[PDB]
Amino acid sequence: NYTFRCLQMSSFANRSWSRTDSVVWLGDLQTHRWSNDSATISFTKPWSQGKLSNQQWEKLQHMFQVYRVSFTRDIQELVKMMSPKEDYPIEIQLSAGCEMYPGNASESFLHVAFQGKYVVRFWGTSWQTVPGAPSWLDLPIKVLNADQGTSATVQMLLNDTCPLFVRGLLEAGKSDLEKQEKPVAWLSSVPGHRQLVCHVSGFYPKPVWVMWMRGDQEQQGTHRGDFLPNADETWYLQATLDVEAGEEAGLACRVKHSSLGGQDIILYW
Amino acid sequence: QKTPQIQVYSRHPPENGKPNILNCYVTQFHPPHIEIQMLKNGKKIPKVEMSDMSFSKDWSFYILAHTEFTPTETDTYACRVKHASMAEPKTVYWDRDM
Numbered sequence: 373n374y375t376f377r378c379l380q381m382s383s384f385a386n387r388s389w390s391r392t393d394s395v396v397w398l399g400d401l402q403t404h405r406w407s408n409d410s411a412t413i414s415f416t417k418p419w420s421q422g423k424l425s426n427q428q429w430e431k432l433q434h435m436f437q438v439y440r441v442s443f444t445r446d447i448q449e450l451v452k453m454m455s456p457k458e459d460y461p462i463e464i465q466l467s468a469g470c471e472m473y474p475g476n477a478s479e480s481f482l483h484v485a486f487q488g489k490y491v492v493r494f495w496g497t498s499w500q501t502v503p504g505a506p507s508w509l510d511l512p513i514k515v516l517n518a519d520q521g522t523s524a525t526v527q528m529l530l531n532d533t534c535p536l537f538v539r540g541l542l543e544a545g546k547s548d549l550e551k552q553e554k555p556v557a558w559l560s561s562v563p564g565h566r567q568l569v570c571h572v573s574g575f576y577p578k579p580v581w582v583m584w585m586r587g588d589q590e591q592q593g594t595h596r597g598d599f600l601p602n603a604d605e606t607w608y609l610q611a612t613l614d615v616e617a618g619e620e621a622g623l624a625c626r627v628k629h630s631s632l633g634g635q636d637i638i639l640y641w
Numbered sequence: 642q643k644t645p646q647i648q649v650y651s652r653h654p655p656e657n658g659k660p661n662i663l664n665c666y667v668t669q670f671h672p673p674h675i676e677i678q679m680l681k682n683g684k685k686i687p688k689v690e691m692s693d694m695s696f697s698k699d700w701s702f703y704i705l706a707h708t709e710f711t712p713t714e715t716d717t718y719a720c721r722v723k724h725a726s727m728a729e730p731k732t733v734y735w736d737r738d739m
């Protein structure tokens with residue numbers, strides 16, 4: 373079940389300074405980037421064009437190129453219109469894409485946050501404010517909905533382009549999406565109760581099991597940390613256990629991960 | 642305005658004198674404007690690589706910085722973050738285990 377997420381981050385500091393940067397994700401892998409500094413979208417994977425021909429990709433990119441300039445001027449206009457109630461600095465974020473299922477695969481979304489708060493979505497055939505959003509958004513959204521052409525394009529992109537493109541991506545990026553990288557683990561602790569730490573790094577895909585054991589008995593105090601990214605598209609996770617000094621003996625950290633194939637890592641303290 | 646969290650950890654098991662990569666993962670902050678440095682003995686490392694900034698489901702931003710490094714037991718390493726949510730830079734030291 374993969375989610376394809378196009379994330380836009382736009383910052384408007386004043387009338388003479390703004391930037392828009394985007395990143396695109398397929399599951400936990402980055403597939404595109406588009407810096408304010410670049411004229412065109414960059415592939416971050418060899419397969420990032422999915423199954424689109426050179427021509428279809430160029431058309432889609434031209435649309436995004438026009439959109440980036442238009443978006444910028446639109447927000448500048450929305451501020452002029454709504455000011456002083458809403459003035460700089462302004463942060464706007466857009467999260468758009470689709471999630472693929474079995475059979476006929478998809479649900480699309482386009483959510484918009486203003487100053488870090490979710491306020492607007494595209495839904496059905498038009499933009500709408502979400503319940504609880506500030507009333508000053510009323511006129512800007514009516515003004516935005518008056519653009520029937522944009523609405524038609526957004527509906528197409530979400531309903532048709534996004535799932536088709538993503539089907540092609542999943543196909544073309546199959547080997548990477550299914551790559552297996554092996555975790556490496558190591559133990560440490562800080563010195564009367566000791567906190568024991570089992571570090572596991574370099575695994576891909578994300579699902580993993582890590583647990584402190586004493587023989588076959590699971591150590592219930594095992595506390596799993598957050599999944600942390602490495603720069604090389606693998607993961608890092610640590611698992612800790614509070615113990616009494618002179619109790620570490622006998623303890624072991626066991627690691628199960630799909631890339632190991634039955635050869636679990638078991639590291640004895 | 643959300644204050645950044647900082648986690649510092651190595652790519653591989655830290656072995657003294659062996660080249661490695663140290664990561665500094667900065668998360669849960671807003672607005673996105675931020676300055677991140679990685680330090681060796683309190684001194685800025687010039688070669689630091691930064692991931693593209695992104696944001697989570699809750700709309701808070703995150704970024705990964707990393708740099709090549711060789712642990713020893715004579716050098717300290719840290720990540721230092723300047724953000725509007727804090728009146729002073731926050732430095733967090735690599736704890737030599739992580």
Ligand SMILES: *[C@@H]1O[C@H](CO)[C@@H](O[C@@H]2O[C@H](CO)[C@@H](O[C@@H]3O[C@H](CO[C@H]4O[C@H](CO)[C@@H](O)[C@H](O)[C@@H]4O)[C@@H](O)[C@H](O[C@H]4O[C@H](CO)[C@@H](O)[C@H](O)[C@@H]4O)[C@@H]3O)[C@H](O)[C@H]2NC(C)=O)[C@H](O)[C@H]1NC(C)=O
Binds near residue numbers: 496528531
């Ligand atoms: C992209 O995909 C989205 C869905 O995510 C499509 O959105 C739908 O668009 C259609 C038609 O444009 C809408 O259909 C209309 O529904 C009306 C009732 O809407 C409510 O009720 C339904 C449940 O029944 C809810 O799902 C919905 O959210 C609303 O609460 C009907 O009253 C309409 O009937 C009237 O109009 C038609 C002509 O348009 C006449 O034939 C009828 O006799 C009648 O007068 C109509 O059926 C639908 O509501 C939209 N769905 C949602 C969820 O909003 C986009 O159309 C699609 N775009 C493209 C280009 O593919």
Ligand SMILES: *[C@@H]1O[C@H](CO)[C@@H](O[C@@H]2O[C@H](CO)[C@@H](O)[C@H](O)[C@H]2NC(C)=O)[C@H](O)[C@H]1NC(C)=O
Binds near residue numbers: 389390409441
């Ligand atoms: C982000 O990119 C845009 C578009 O390339 C830049 O916008 C231009 O800014 C210049 C100089 O300040 C203006 O004179 C132009 O009119 C702008 N062009 C358009 C079409 O928007 C912008 O400067 C970039 N932002 C940053 C902070 O570097």
Ligand SMILES: CCCCCCCCCCCCCCCC(=O)O
Binds near residue numbers: 396526
């Ligand atoms: C409304 C977006 C639906 C998705 C349409 C398919 C586009 C796939 C290509 C991804 C590159 C887009 C880069 C982000 C551009 C932006 O949002 O500013």
Ligand SMILES: *[C@@H]1O[C@H](CO)[C@@H](O)[C@H](O)[C@H]1NC(C)=O
Binds near residue numbers: 385388389
């Ligand atoms: C606008 O914001 C930028 C970015 O912080 C700043 O450098 C500049 O001085 C500001 N003032 C104007 C109106 O140019």
